[PDB]
């Protein structure tokens, strides 16, 4: 259940935090939910 950080404002995704929605479901314009920056933007960690 990979955890991605953001690379901006270091907002980590954790699925376990969001009833294990796996990174590679999030929307195709999914934005970091602190800073607002890209999904492509987050390294897994
Ligand atoms: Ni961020």
Same mark, same amino acid.
């Given at each position: 259940?990979?955890?991605?950080?953001?690379?901006?404002?270091?907002?980590?995704?954790?699925?376990?935090?969001?009833?294990?929605?796996?990174?590679?479901?999030? =929307?195709?314009?999914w934005?970091? =939910?602190?800073?607002?920056?890209?999904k492509?933007?987050?390294? =897994?960690?």
């Amino acid at each position: 259940m990979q955890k991605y950080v953001c690379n901006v404002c270091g907002y980590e995704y954790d699925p376990a935090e969001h009833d294990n929605v796996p990174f590679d479901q999030l =929307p195709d314009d999914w934005c970091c =939910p602190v800073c607002g920056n890209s999904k492509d933007q987050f390294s =897994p960690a």
